[PDB]
Amino acid sequence: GAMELSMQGQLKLGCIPTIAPFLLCDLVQEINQRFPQLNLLLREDTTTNLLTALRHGELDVLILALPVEIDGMESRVVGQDPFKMVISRHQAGAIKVPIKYDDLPDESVFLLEKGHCLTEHAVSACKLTDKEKINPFSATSLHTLVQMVANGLGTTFIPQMAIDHGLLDNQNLVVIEPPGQQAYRDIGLVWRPSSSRSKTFNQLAEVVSELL
Amino acid sequence: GAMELSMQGQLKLGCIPTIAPFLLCDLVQEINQRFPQLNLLLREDTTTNLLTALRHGELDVLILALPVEIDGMESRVVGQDPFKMVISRHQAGAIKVPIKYDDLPDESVFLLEKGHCLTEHAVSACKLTDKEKINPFSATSLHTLVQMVANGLGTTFIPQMAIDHGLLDNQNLVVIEPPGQQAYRDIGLVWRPSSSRSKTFNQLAEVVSELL
């Protein structure tokens, strides 16, 4: 017979669509090795829906792009994800580098529809202020946005973690620096102040920081 | 001075989340070469929302997984997309091959939540009838579903076009045949009977058929 005898157990983690396909692959491989008893149940949803789930205790922690509206939550920025622009190789000549927005054709910049935070982050970080350059047809996923660019229709902003995870492979695209600073978005973990699992979230924040 | 002088112009195409990231990359590369004056504006959305947009004339044509409810629309099946199962390399020993569902642990099969048609197609084509094998935590995107499998939590069904497009790369997964037939989903194009662009859609159907 036999005697009866923070990074263990189950965690419910939410993440936005322009982060989840990319960073979470790396996170799972790391925690498999470093925290083998941590089971990560995963939710992908919009920033607004993730925040509602977090408030309602349906998720333990979020990985978000910041800044977004998170009043009352606790957050920790863990790294920076640069922005690039992309154009098709076949349109590379019709668009001059360095990019100057005023020299682009009207309606040549495609963007995700409002409610994708990639759009608010990229437009502000990359200082696109001339709305006449934005195509009126809004994209509804990062993959189909990039495919329209690959079809030669214009240009857009993409996060570095997508490039590093092969999103552009076999689509004959060229990667270009956007105007302004070296522009980027913050990545952060977000959780409830009343949670009893802050020790877990801070350990997870350290792991995520090393992936950026 | 100078005298004034079907696959040309603009097309609005909708596609479901478990097809769009994969097949549409191939489609754009092909049409760039073969139909260089065809501009493809792209929409990614749920089957139900795509059908509403199609009915309302907000999209010209859909690429769907079939069968789904498309009363009153015109459709053309263009190919078959096999299903596979996946498990993590680290759980490969705890799950025996050939897979028999009755030998899997209870709650070991993760599935996308209802409203993702991948679930209805895979469960029926791969003949999973024991609901006790399904984990109660529903996935909300194919990427995060696969990441939970990569974390060692269980198994799931994935479409071949995702495997062929690198979805499993660097996640240390093993690909296994599901039970039943060589199980698969149909892929098809769907449009309005009253459309004036049937010649375009049938040419597009031929191109898509060659990609499957």
DSSP state of A47: H
Both A28 and A95 in a single domain?
no
Both A94 and A181 in a single domain?
yes
A50 three-state secondary structure: helix
Tell me which residue has tokens 């309606």: A107
Both B61 and B31 in a single domain?
yes
DSSP state of A25: H
Residues 6+ apart with CB under 8 A from A95: A87, A104, A108, A155
Specify whether the CB–CB gap between A109 and A155 falls below 8 A.
Answer: yes
Both A41 and A86 in a single domain?
no
Residue B177 CA to residue B125 CA, distance in Å, equals 12
Residue B204 CA to residue B207 CA, distance in Å, equals 5
Residue A26 CA to residue A20 CA, distance in Å, equals 10
**For the residues of chain B, what is the DSSP string, one character each?**
--------EEEEEEE-TTTHHHHHHHHHHHHHHH-TTEEEEEEE--HHHHHHHHHTTS-SEEEEEESS--TT-EEEEEEEEEEEEEEEGGGSTTS-SS--GGGSPTT-B--BPTT-HHHHHHHHHTT---GGGB-SS-BSSHHHHHHHHHTTS-BEEEEHHHHHTTTTTTS-EEEEPPSSSS-EEEEEEEE-TT-S-HHHHHHHHHHHHHT-
Specify whether the CB–CB gap between A108 and A133 falls below 8 A.
Answer: yes
Q: Which amino acid is at A41?
A: L
Specify whether the CB–CB gap between B145 and B112 falls below 8 A.
Answer: yes
- If one counts every other C-beta atom within 10 angstroms of the C-beta of residue B35, the result is 18
CATH number (domain holding residue B70): 3.40.190.10
Spell out which residues of chain A touch residue B151, defining contact as CB-CB under 8 Å: 28, 31-32, 39-40
Residue A144 CA to residue A41 CA, distance in Å, equals 26
Both B212 and B199 in a single domain?
yes
Helix axes A142-150 and B20-34, enclosed angle (nearest 10) = 10
Element counts in chain A: helices (H) and strands (E) = 6, 7
- If one counts every other C-beta atom within 10 angstroms of the C-beta of residue B181, the result is 10
CA A113 to chain CA centroid, nearest Å = 15
Reported as type and span, the H/E element at residue A184 is: strand A184-191
Specify whether the CB–CB gap between B9 and B40 falls below 8 A.
Answer: no
Q: Which residue of A has its CA nearest to B42?
A: A144
For residue B140, give the nearest of A25, A40, A44 by CB distance: A44
Both B181 and B122 in a single domain?
yes
Pairing of β B184-191 and β B61-66: antiparallel
Q: What is the CA radius of gyration of chain A?
A: 19
CA angle A110, A187, A189 (to 5 degrees): 135
Q: What is the CA radius of gyration of chain B?
A: 19
Reported as type and span, the H/E element at residue A176 is: strand A173-176
CA angle A162, A163, A167 (to 5 degrees): 70
Instruction: Please provide residue B35's backbone torsions phi and psi, each rounded to the nearest 5 degrees.
Output: -135, 70
Name the token pair of A14. Answer: 């939410």
Residue A51 CA to residue A54 CA, distance in Å, equals 5
Residue B49 CA to residue B99 CA, distance in Å, equals 35
Residue B211 CA to residue B205 CA, distance in Å, equals 10
Pairing of β A9-15 and β A38-44: parallel
Q: Which of A160, A182, A76, A42 is nearest to B141 (CA)?
A: A42
User: Given in angstroms, what resolution was this structure solved at?
Assistant: 1.5
Q: What is the four-CA torsion angle of A19, A23, A28, A30, rounded to 10 degrees?
A: -150
Both B9 and B24 in a single domain?
yes
Residues 6+ apart with CB under 8 A from A20: A42, A44, A63, B141, B143, B144, B147
Query: Environment class of residue B106 by beta-carbon count within 10 Å: exposed (0-12), middle (13-18) or buried (19+)?
Result: exposed
Helix axes A20-34 and A198-210, enclosed angle (nearest 10) = 110
Residues 6+ apart with CB under 8 A from A160: A81, A82, A83, A84, A184
Residue A112 CA to residue A146 CA, distance in Å, equals 10
- If one counts every other C-beta atom within 10 angstroms of the C-beta of residue A17, the result is 22
Spell out which residues of chain B touch residue A141, defining contact as CB-CB under 8 Å: 17, 20-21, 44
Both A166 and A120 in a single domain?
yes
Q: Which of B147, B191, B199 is nearest to B173 (CA)?
A: B147
Residue A152 CA to residue B30 CA, distance in Å, equals 13
Identify residues of A whose CB sits under 8 angstroms from chain B CBs: 15, 17, 20-21, 24-25, 28-29, 31-32, 39-45, 88, 90, 137, 139-141, 143-145, 147-148, 150-153, 166, 169-172
Q: Which amino acid is at B165?
A: H
Beta-ladder partners of A54: none
Spell out which residues of chain A touch residue B152, defining contact as CB-CB under 8 Å: 32, 39
Residue B12 CA to residue B38 CA, distance in Å, equals 11
Both B43 and B132 in a single domain?
no
Helix axes A20-34 and B142-150, enclosed angle (nearest 10) = 10
Specify whether the CB–CB gap between A172 and B29 falls below 8 A.
Answer: yes
Number of CB pairs, chain A paired with chain B, less than 8 A apart: 111
Reported as type and span, the H/E element at residue A149 is: helix A142-150
Kindly determine whether residue B144 and residue A42, on different chains, have CB atoms separated by under 8 Å: yes
Name the token pair of A92. Answer: 């590379």
Spell out which residues of chain A touch residue B24, defining contact as CB-CB under 8 Å: 143-144, 147
Specify whether the CB–CB gap between A135 and A107 falls below 8 A.
Answer: yes
Residues 6+ apart with CB under 8 A from B206: none
Reported as type and span, the H/E element at residue A190 is: strand A184-191
Kindly determine whether residue A140 and residue B15, on different chains, have CB atoms separated by under 8 Å: no
Both B90 and B138 in a single domain?
yes
Range of the domain at B45: 1-81+187-212
Both A173 and A137 in a single domain?
yes
Query: Environment class of residue B30 by beta-carbon count within 10 Å: exposed (0-12), middle (13-18) or buried (19+)?
Result: middle
Residue A196 CA to residue A132 CA, distance in Å, equals 49
Q: Which of B190, B186, B141 is nearest to B160 (CA)?
A: B186
Both B172 and B96 in a single domain?
yes
Tell me which residue has tokens 């009838």: B129
Note the residue count of chain B.
212
Per the structure, how many domains does chain A have?
A: 2
